[PDB]
Amino acid sequence: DIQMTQTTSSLSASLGDRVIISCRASQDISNYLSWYQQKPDGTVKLLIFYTSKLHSGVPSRFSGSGSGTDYSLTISNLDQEDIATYFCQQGNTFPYTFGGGTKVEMRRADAAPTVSIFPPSSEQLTSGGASVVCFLNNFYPKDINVKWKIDGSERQNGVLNSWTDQDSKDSTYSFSSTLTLTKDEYERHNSYTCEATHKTSTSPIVKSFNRNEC
Amino acid sequence: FNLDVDSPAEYSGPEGSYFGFAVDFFVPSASSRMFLLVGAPKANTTQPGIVEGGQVLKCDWSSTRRCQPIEFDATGNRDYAKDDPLEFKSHQWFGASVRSKQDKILACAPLYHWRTEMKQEREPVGTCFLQDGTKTVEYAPCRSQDIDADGQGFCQGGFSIDFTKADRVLLGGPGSFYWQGQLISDQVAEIVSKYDPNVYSIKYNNQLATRTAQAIFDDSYLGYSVAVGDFNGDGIDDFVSGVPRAARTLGMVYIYDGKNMSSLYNFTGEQMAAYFGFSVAATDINGDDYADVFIGAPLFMDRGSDGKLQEVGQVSVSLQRASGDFQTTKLNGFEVFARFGSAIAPLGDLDQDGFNDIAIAAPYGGEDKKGIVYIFNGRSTGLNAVPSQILEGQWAARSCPPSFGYSMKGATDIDKNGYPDLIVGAFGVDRAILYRARPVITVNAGLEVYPSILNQDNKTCSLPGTALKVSCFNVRFCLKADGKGVLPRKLNFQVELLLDKLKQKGAIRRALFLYSRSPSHSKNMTISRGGLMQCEELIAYLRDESEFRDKLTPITIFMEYRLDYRTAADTTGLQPILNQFTPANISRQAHILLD
Amino acid sequence: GCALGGAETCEDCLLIGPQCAWCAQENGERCDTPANLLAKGCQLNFIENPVSQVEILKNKPLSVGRQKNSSDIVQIAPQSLILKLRPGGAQTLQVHVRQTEDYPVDLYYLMDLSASMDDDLNTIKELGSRLSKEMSKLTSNFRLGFGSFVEKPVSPFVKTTPEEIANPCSSIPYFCLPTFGFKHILPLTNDAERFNEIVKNQKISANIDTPEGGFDAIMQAAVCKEKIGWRNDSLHLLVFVSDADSHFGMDSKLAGIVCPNDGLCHLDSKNEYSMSTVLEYPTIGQLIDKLVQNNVLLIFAVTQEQVHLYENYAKLIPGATVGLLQKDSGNILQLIISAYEELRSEVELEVLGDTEGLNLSFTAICNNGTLFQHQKKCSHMKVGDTASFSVTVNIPHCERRSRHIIIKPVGLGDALELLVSPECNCDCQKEVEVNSSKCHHGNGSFQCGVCACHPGHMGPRCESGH
Amino acid sequence: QVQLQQSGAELAEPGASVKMSCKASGYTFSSFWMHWVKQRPGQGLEWIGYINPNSGYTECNEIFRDKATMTADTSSSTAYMQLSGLTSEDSAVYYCASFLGRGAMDYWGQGTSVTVSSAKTTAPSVYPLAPVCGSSVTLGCLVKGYFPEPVTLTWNSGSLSAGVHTFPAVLQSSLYTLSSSVTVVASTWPSQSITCNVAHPASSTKVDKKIEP
Ligand SMILES: *[C@@H]1O[C@H](CO)[C@@H](O[C@@H]2O[C@H](CO)[C@@H](O[C@@H]3O[C@H](CO[C@H]4O[C@H](CO[C@H]5O[C@H](CO)[C@@H](O)[C@H](O)[C@@H]5O)[C@@H](O)[C@H](O[C@H]5O[C@H](CO)[C@@H](O)[C@H](O)[C@@H]5O)[C@@H]4O)[C@@H](O)[C@H](O)[C@@H]3O)[C@H](O)[C@H]2NC(C)=O)[C@H](O)[C@H]1NC(C)=O
Ligand SMILES: *[C@@H]1O[C@H](CO)[C@@H](O[C@@H]2O[C@H](CO)[C@@H](O[C@@H]3O[C@H](CO[C@H]4O[C@H](CO)[C@@H](O)[C@H](O)[C@@H]4O)[C@@H](O)[C@H](O[C@H]4O[C@H](CO)[C@@H](O)[C@H](O)[C@@H]4O)[C@@H]3O)[C@H](O)[C@H]2NC(C)=O)[C@H](O)[C@H]1NC(C)=O
Ligand SMILES: *[C@@H]1O[C@H](CO)[C@@H](O[C@@H]2O[C@H](CO)[C@@H](O[C@@H]3O[C@H](CO)[C@@H](O)[C@H](O)[C@@H]3O)[C@H](O)[C@H]2NC(C)=O)[C@H](O)[C@H]1NC(C)=O
Ligand SMILES: *[C@@H]1O[C@H](CO)[C@@H](O[C@@H]2O[C@H](CO)[C@@H](O[C@@H]3O[C@H](CO)[C@@H](O)[C@H](O)[C@@H]3O)[C@H](O)[C@H]2NC(C)=O)[C@H](O)[C@H]1NC(C)=O
Ligand SMILES: O=C(O)[C@H](c1cc(F)ccc1[C@@H]1CCCCO1)N1CC[C@@H](OCCCCc2ccc3c(n2)NCCC3)C1
Ligand SMILES: *[C@@H]1O[C@H](CO)[C@@H](O)[C@H](O)[C@H]1NC(C)=O
Ligand SMILES: [Ca+2]
Ligand SMILES: [Ca+2]
Ligand SMILES: [Ca+2]
Ligand SMILES: [Ca+2]
Ligand SMILES: [Ca+2]
Ligand SMILES: [Ca+2]
Ligand SMILES: [Mg+2]
Structure with a gap:
């Protein structure tokens, strides 16, 4: 099979900027390369076929170039509706194969996350089990790390995390981390700490509480 | 009956190009000068590397009588890869079918082949080009992803074509689905707006197409011929198509609804291998605003007086009725192996009598296969069974037969004289010919003889000489005429009277004219259109009883009226003609009294 | 019966009906049945009435048994006929077919x-x-x-x-x-x-x-x-x-x-x-x-x-x-x-040539004289059996050209050549005696007991001038 | 105006099979190939194969040769794909896409999610999240142990939308868990009541959880 590789998996851009996405095939594909846009909701649209030909209904901003093994999609004058993921696809030989994808996200000023930690609800404890939830909201850029320290010791066993799509109004991301235990284990220790490390501050932002205390 | 055969416009094309294989009229929307469209499917073109790509020509009407190719496509074969053509335009028969509606011209190449993008193939999907003034687009509805004989790879789309009243295209492709055939209809607006040269199989919205069916229907050739007309009274033209191999070679004609391609009505031939459905046409011939179906079976064999089968061809005429039924009649050819019915051309109202007319061709009839075209006039009952005119091809060929009449087109008044005109193609001699319709003069004639009863013993008249009197009576002949279209307001008629016409070679004529003393009187007359009855009286008498012993057989007064056609000519050079359906003779009779 | 419309010339008289004759002189309406003309007084020598007749030119017998010489094979008899048909007249030919026992x-x-x-x-x-x-x-x-x-x-x-x-x-x-x-x-x-x-x-x-x-x-x-x-x-x-x-x-x-x-x-x-x-x-x-x-x-x-x-x-x-x-x-x-x-085991008759415009009727007699059928085919016959056919021929109108026709069994070359010749002219037609005394001093020609007038003279004996 | 309308999300146990449909409109369905593409959650695009609708002929990526079978109903302009022998690796969104020609696929369906799981329909547990004993305040919900997707979550029946962050669901011991945060002005809570509204249609569940301390 033909292997397709889009070297950069993510890139950030501002409105109006020119964006270039590169795609390399493992063999000559004789210009049978197409480009697709996938929006957050899963919608998929064809933009460019046969290297440089524009699909009907597609705005002129999109154009494509290349030959042999190297190909590129170019977005000039980026629009808000252009924030999506872009895939290349060779159609020279079966099976058709796609590149790994390149995500285009809006550029923003760096913003520190607003962190909030939550102890298990009373309802959950009666059922058995305890979940500690930590929310990190409205931060840029997307990269961030969360560490759970009950008593100065990382757990990293029952933790589950979820991330939001980039927000449309403000190009920020958000993060939910949930440490889940048994009610027994929860009631054995006293302090509970949600630790966040972000590019914007050298010192990890820390939010914590003590179970006993109130 | 009013077509001018003395001085038809004669057009020619390159030898061997089949110039005249297809013909149509071209009338732009700006009321510009009209032209003739002529297909030459074997003509060589300037397209790089293309042999006998074929061309469609536009021909001036009488300004120069010249034909110039239309540049639908100047390019050669696109390449899929180096030394790997995407398509093959040589011997593609471009111009095998040509149709025009206002500004739009549709021309097709039923033998255009293409490669497909997966394997190196050579599949005759056919292609068409649609020209609308500046913009020209390719229309290849059968060049799809449904490949090979199973699909549309051998469809030969454009084998037959027509335009609907509402700017839809009707296209026939007789090869689809193992030669079941197919009908495809697209809106012209979709064909132009969705055209993209980078996409070989265009997705047209609101496309109507017949669907693949069971293998039993294979090799039927649906789409061999098409015509359009309304047959469920909703104002939307419906699709009529010949299916000449269907029903185990009896032939069928399918009618489909023009809104959704649902089956509406079927016709079935009566004889094996008659090629019923070779040609089809739709036109209202009986003046009830209901389109009627015409179907040609050029190989139909009739039984003769001696009991021998003879191939003369047959045409069936089906009048549409409000109930939805059809009233069918058959018309047989006149000459063996002439293939009467190969082409059927609605003429419009050729004689402007209120009923549409049709022309039926016998391309291999006449002397030395020169070809014959028959003109049939409509009437309220249906089509008149007897042809009122016979056009004879004038040119002979040295290889393929002249085929005068193989294609025809009428129903266009190209000289604006008020009568539709006719184009006849003759591709085996590379000729196309326009025949102009002459104005038609209708005459009302009257003849009165009083007293009707004659008594030999009633001598109240005196001859110019001594004579001593004779029995006399009065004869009063009247004539009145009018016309439609470009005509003068003054016409010279030759009128002849003959007394006692019943009596033949060697028999006594009992009545004579007073002055002439002979039984014949001739009078030249001058009459103007729209005018009043212009009459003239003269006097006649009987011989003495001594000279004839026949007082029983009646005395018939006969009147003829002819017209001098040359004197009534117009700027066109086009003489009018007398309406052949009113008889140009009238007769009354007197009687001898008995005692 | 034959005194109807027309009927004022010998050639015109023959055309209307097969059984009409024409009288000559007297001792209008001379077109009538030959018996009626004799009743009116016409002599037998004067009566004029051509009749359809058949002349047999070649009628070699059908060959019986295996033939050692390909030239003595005869599968259709007669081989040639002349059929003189009066305009409108009908004649029936008997045609006999028998397949030889050894045929290539x-x-x-x-x-x-x-x-x-x-x-x-x-x-x-x-x-x-x-x-x-x-x-x-x-x-x-x-x-x-x-x-x-x-x-x-x-x-x-x-x-x-x-x-x-x-x-x-x-x-x-x-x-x-x-x-x-x-x-x-x-x-x-x-x-x-x-x-x-x-x-x-x-x-x-x-x-x-x-x-x-x-x-x-x-x-x-x-x-x-x-x-x-x-x-x-x-x-x-x-x-x-x-x-x-x-x-x-x-x-x-x-x-x-x-x-x-x-x-x-x-x-x-x-x-x-x-x-x-x-x-x-x-x-x-x-x-x-x-x-x-x-x-x-x-x-x-x-x-x-x-x-x-x-x-x-x-x-x-x-x-x-x-x-x-x-x-x-x-x-x-x-x-x-x-x-x-x-x-x-079958014999089917075929008729080729200038047949257009002719009326043909076929009756087939099979198994000797026992079976009669209105077809041109006898079936279920043993090789050597003889199939006989009645072929009725009629010309509806008079013509000038003779017709060359062939009757043959389907599949075999043995052919009956048939010449159909019209007979729509009277004998007297060729003895004009022009400018005869009988038509008012040479104002006409005396053809068949009637005057054929010269131009400009009308009458039964051409006695008036115009 | 081409539109490919795909059928709804599928659920099945391992070893079972599912069949999904893709109805076409706006073009002559039988004249164009239909392609099928598989996207695993948090993964790329994978080409399965194509079908020629009018002839039934198909070609597949070698991977899916035994996994998938494509069919088509020309009278209803509908292509079908059946996935047989299901495993967790077959859990993904599956797209249909018409063939443009030129080695490209021009129009895509919205996708049909397929989830391969032994779990049985389980109702959610909704837990209120209040802070611990200051211009704005963040409250939250936790919806734990429900199956299958989807759940819908709103705050005060949708009155609060700006300042709400609802995260995608995650798998947790074969069941889905979900959380949502809402942020309001410190002066406006607890003085006014903020309520988590959670609905799990597959369970005829409708819970409202107010947050008090
Ligand atoms: C493909 O398209 C076809 C045409 O669009 C469609 O056929 C249509 O089907 C619908 C529903 O099945 C019918 O509507 C039904 O009508 C009946 C009663 O209908 C009667 O009255 C109407 C009204 O007449 C007016 O319009 C006509 C225009 O055609 C005028 O001349 C007339 O003067 C009036 O102004 C009439 O049209 C109908 O006539 C049709 O049918 C009769 C009987 O078959 C024929 O004699 C006639 O030629 C014509 O075909 C009819 O007399 C009502 O009871 C229902 O409730 C419903 O409203 C349409 O009438 C019908 N149209 C046709 C047949 O032209 C096909 O169904 C469609 N196929 C597919 C697969 O989609
Ligand atoms: C004018 O003449 C034409 C041609 O004779 C007629 O068109 C044919 O009409 C018949 C009758 O409708 C059509 O036959 C029908 O085909 C349907 C399609 O079958 C599908 O499934 C089969 C599975 O075997 C596939 O092979 C096929 O490709 C399709 O995918 C059938 O479903 C129909 O079956 C129904 O009717 C039959 C009648 O015997 C019943 O026995 C069945 O139980 C079922 O109810 C039917 O067989 C045929 O395809 C048409 N041919 C063409 C070329 O169009 C017109 O109907 C006729 N019009 C008029 C006005 O007379
Ligand atoms: C269009 O131009 C082509 C040439 O580009 C013409 O074709 C050539 O001319 C004739 C065909 O009529 C061929 O010569 C013939 O060859 C055959 C077989 O070799 C032989 O049997 C004949 O005796 C004669 O010599 C020639 O090969 C052919 N070349 C091709 C087709 O490549 C064609 O005639 C032109 N057509 C018109 C309508 O002008
Ligand atoms: C004897 O012969 C003459 C014919 O030459 C008769 O006299 C004519 O009689 C006719 C009547 O048919 C007169 O016709 C007139 O014509 C118009 C109407 O058509 C009008 O004038 C009258 O109403 C009348 O009908 C005609 O004038 C008269 N004269 C001539 C010269 O024809 C005569 O009647 C014949 N026999 C007898 C018994 O009178
Ligand atoms: O005669 C031959 O030389 C050749 C032949 C005979 C043989 F014995 C072996 C092989 C062949 C040749 C050998 C080389 C390749 C082609 O086939 N015949 C000629 C016609 C062809 O048979 C059509 C079946 C239609 C039945 C159907 C199938 C599918 C559909 C439809 N009809 N109708 C609509 C679409 C679906 C094979
Ligand atoms: C029989 O063959 C000879 C020459 O072998 C030929 O002259 C004759 O025409 C043939 N028979 C017929 C009926 O033509
Ligand atoms: Ca065999
Ligand atoms: Ca064959
Ligand atoms: Ca209609
Ligand atoms: Ca009508
Ligand atoms: Ca007319
Ligand atoms: Ca005219
Ligand atoms: Mg074969």
Whole structure:
């Protein structure tokens, strides 16, 4: 099979900027390369076929170039509706194969996350089990790390995390981390700490509480 | 009956190009000068590397009588890869079918082949080009992803074509689905707006197409011929198509609804291998605003007086009725192996009598296969069974037969004289010919003889000489005429009277004219259109009883009226003609009294 | 009865009715029955009345028993007649037919060689010898030939890629020869093992659409007398062997072939049909014309799926029959023998020549005088039996030209030559006696007891002037 | 106006099979190939194969040769794909896409999610999240142990939308868990009541959880 590789998996851009996405095939594909846009909701649209030909209904901003093994999609004058993921696809030989994808996200000023930690609800404890939830909201850029320290010791066993799509109004991301235990284990220790490390501050932002205390 | 055969416009094309294989009229929307469209499917073109790509020509009407190719496509074969053509335009028969509606011209190449993008193939999907003034687009509805004989790879789309009243295209492709055939209809607006040269199989919205069916229907050739007309009274033209191999070679004609391609009505031939459905046409011939179906079976064999089968061809005429039924009649050819019915051309109202007319061709009839075209006039009952005119091809060929009449087109008044005109193609001699319709003069004639009863013993008249009197009576002949279209307001008629016409070679004529003393009187007359009855009286008498012993057989007064056609000519050079359906003779009779 | 409208000239009198006569002189309305004219006073010498008559020129008796000399065979009697028909008159000819016991037989085996006939080739490897051994019990002069057909080798009936042109089965893969129209391979011969050899050497071909091009081959096999080898004075059996529909007429229009078949022989140096890509397939009408003209009997040996179609074709084609062929031609020998035995047990009359405008009625007398039927065919007869036919002939109007006509049994060359000559003129017509005293001093001519007036003179004796 | 309308989300146990449909409109369905593409959650695009609708002929990526079978109903302009022998690796969104030609696929369906799981329909447990004993305040919900997707979550029946962050669901011991945060002005809570509204249609569940301390 033909292997397709889009070297950069993510890139950030501002409105109006020119964006270039590169795609390399493992063999000559004789210009049978197409480009697709996938929006957050899963919608998929064809933009460019046969290297440089524009699909009907597609705005002129999109154009494509290349030959042999190297190909590129170019977005000039980026629009808000252009924030999506872009895939290349060779159609020279079966099976058709796609590149790994390149995500285009809006550029923003760096913003520190607003962190909030939550102890298990009373309802959950009666059922058995305890979940500690930590929310990190409205931060840029997307990269961030969360560490759970009950008593100065990382757990990293029952933790589950979820991330939001980039927000449309403000190009920020958000993060939910949930440490889940048994009610027994929860009631054995006293302090509970949600630790966040972000590019914007050298010192990890820390939010914590003590179970006993109130 | 009013077509001018003395001085038809004669057009020619390159030898061997089949110039005249297809013909149509071209009338732009700006009321510009009209032209003739002529297909030459074997003509060589300037397209790089293309042999006998074929061309469609536009021909001036009488300004120069010249034909110039239309540049639908100047390019050669696109390449899929180096030394790997995407398509093959040589011997593609471009111009095998040509149709025009206002500004739009549709021309097709039923033998255009293409490669497909997966394997190196050579599949005759056919292609068409649609020209609308500046913009020209390719229309290849059968060049799809449904490949090979199973699909549309051998469809030969454009084998037959027509335009609907509402700017839809009707296209026939007789090869689809193992030669079941197919009908495809697209809106012209979709064909132009969705055209993209980078996409070989265009997705047209609101496309109507017949669907693949069971293998039993294979090799039927649906789409061999098409015509359009309304047959469920909703104002939307419906699709009529010949299916000449269907029903185990009896032939069928399918009618489909023009809104959704649902089956509406079927016709079935009566004889094996008659090629019923070779040609089809739709036109209202009986003046009830209901389109009627015409179907040609050029190989139909009739039984003769001696009991021998003879191939003369047959045409069936089906009048549409409000109930939805059809009233069918058959018309047989006149000459063996002439293939009467190969082409059927609605003429419009050729004689402007209120009923549409049709022309039926016998391309291999006449002397030395020169070809014959028959003109049939409509009437309220249906089509008149007897042809009122016979056009004879004038040119002979040295290889393929002249085929005068193989294609025809009428129903266009190209000289604006008020009568539709006719184009006849003759591709085996590379000729196309326009025949102009002459104005038609209708005459009302009257003849009165009083007293009707004659008594030999009633001598109240005196001859110019001594004579001593004779029995006399009065004869009063009247004539009145009018016309439609470009005509003068003054016409010279030759009128002849003959007394006692019943009596033949060697028999006594009992009545004579007073002055002439002979039984014949001739009078030249001058009459103007729209005018009043212009009459003239003269006097006649009987011989003495001594000279004839026949007082029983009646005395018939006969009147003829002819017209001098040359004197009534117009700027066109086009003489009018007398309406052949009113008889140009009238007769009354007197009687001898008995005692 | 014959005194009606017209009837004022001898020639005019004869035209209205077959049984009308014309009187001469007296001792208007001289047109009446010969008996009525005698009753009115007309003498027997004066009465004028031509009558239809038959003259027998050649009536050699029908030959009885096996004949050692091909020249003493007589299967139709009489052999030549002159039929003088009064305008409107009708005459009945008796025609007698008897098949001789030893009559030569030509059989041209014409075979579909498309890809579904591969098995068929394997099972007929010894058809030649098996067949001529059986036919030797029935005739001492059996000859057989071979020919093959597939399809017009042009788009859209074949694939036109280089690979498929070179081998239309390359896609399978399987060895097939290039598609071809018609190969005439073995002219008629008594050498049955030669037939075996050529069959054993045949390879199949292929094409892409079901209906085949065998009608082209039928036309060439019927018309190419010298190259096929048909001999006079023998049966001509053309056995068409196929498991498919047949292209006809303007089917070739799909391929851009739009020049009608011309009915001529077009075998080239390779003995292949050279107009395959040039001329339309024949129409049934064209095939009928040439099969009748070359006296070729067509036997459709076709599979179950095709029988009904080819039966309907055979209804239209004089002398044609249909046999039901197995998917591998396993029974082709039995089909041929059956069709041959049917032909030898039947006699069907055929009438050729200038027949248009004539009224013909046929009555057949079979099994000696016992059975009468209003057909032109006697059936279920033993070879040597005699079939008799009443052939009634009538000319409706008078004409000038004689008609040359032939009556013959379907399938046989023995012909009855018939000359139909009109007789619409009276004897007196040729004795004008112009300027006779009887028409007012030479104002006319005295033809048949009446005055034919000169121009400008009207009257029974031309006695008034205008 | 081409539109490919795909059928709804599929659920099945391992070893079972599912069949999904893709109805076409706006073009002549039988004249164009239909392609099928598989996207695993948090993964790329994978080409399965195509079908020629009018002839039934198909070609597949070698991977899916035994996994998928494509079919088509030309009278209803609908293509079908059946996935047989299901495993967790077959859990993904499956797209249909018409063939443009030129080695490209021009119009895509919205996708049909396929989830391969032994779990049985389980109702959610909704837990209120209040802070611990200051201009704005963040409250939250936790919806734990429900199956299958989807759940819908709103705050005060949708009155609060700005300042709400609802995260995608995550798998947790074969069941889905979900959380949502809402942020309001410190002066406006607890003085006014903020309520988590959670609905799990597959369970006929409708819970409202107010947050008090
Ligand atoms: C493909 O398209 C076809 C045409 O669009 C469609 O056929 C249509 O089907 C619908 C529903 O099945 C019918 O509507 C039904 O009508 C009946 C009663 O209908 C009667 O009255 C109407 C009204 O007449 C007015 O319009 C006509 C224009 O045609 C005028 O001339 C007339 O003067 C009036 O102004 C009439 O049209 C109908 O006539 C049709 O049918 C009769 C009987 O078959 C024929 O004599 C006639 O030629 C014409 O075909 C009819 O007399 C009502 O009871 C229902 O509730 C419903 O409203 C349409 O009438 C019908 N149209 C046709 C047949 O032209 C096909 O169904 C469609 N196929 C597919 C697969 O989608
Ligand atoms: C004018 O003449 C034409 C041609 O003779 C007629 O058109 C044919 O009409 C018949 C009758 O409707 C059509 O046959 C029908 O085909 C349907 C499609 O079948 C699907 O499924 C089969 C599975 O075997 C596939 O092979 C096929 O490709 C399709 O996918 C069938 O479903 C129909 O079956 C129904 O009717 C039959 C009648 O015997 C019942 O037995 C069944 O139970 C079922 O209810 C039917 O067989 C045929 O395809 C048409 N041919 C063409 C070329 O269009 C017109 O109807 C006729 N018009 C008029 C006005 O007379
Ligand atoms: C269009 O131009 C082409 C040439 O580009 C013409 O074709 C050439 O002319 C004739 C065909 O009429 C061919 O000569 C003939 O060859 C055949 C076989 O070799 C032979 O049987 C004849 O006796 C004659 O010599 C020639 O090969 C052919 N070349 C091709 C087709 O490549 C064609 O005639 C022109 N057509 C028109 C309508 O002008
Ligand atoms: C004897 O012969 C003459 C004919 O030459 C008769 O006299 C004519 O009689 C006719 C009547 O048929 C007169 O016709 C008139 O014509 C118009 C109407 O058509 C009008 O004038 C009258 O109403 C009348 O009908 C005609 O004038 C008269 N004269 C001539 C010269 O024809 C005569 O009647 C014949 N026999 C007898 C018994 O009178
Ligand atoms: O005669 C031949 O040389 C050749 C042949 C015979 C053989 F025995 C072996 C092989 C062949 C050749 C060999 C080389 C490649 C082509 O086939 N015939 C000619 C016509 C062709 O048979 C059509 C079946 C239609 C039945 C159907 C199938 C599918 C559909 C439809 N009809 N109708 C609509 C779409 C779906 C094979
Ligand atoms: C019989 O053959 C001879 C020459 O062999 C030929 O002259 C004659 O025309 C043939 N018979 C007929 C009826 O034509
Ligand atoms: Ca309609
Ligand atoms: Ca009508
Ligand atoms: Ca008229
Ligand atoms: Ca005119
Ligand atoms: Ca076989
Ligand atoms: Ca064939
Ligand atoms: Mg075959």
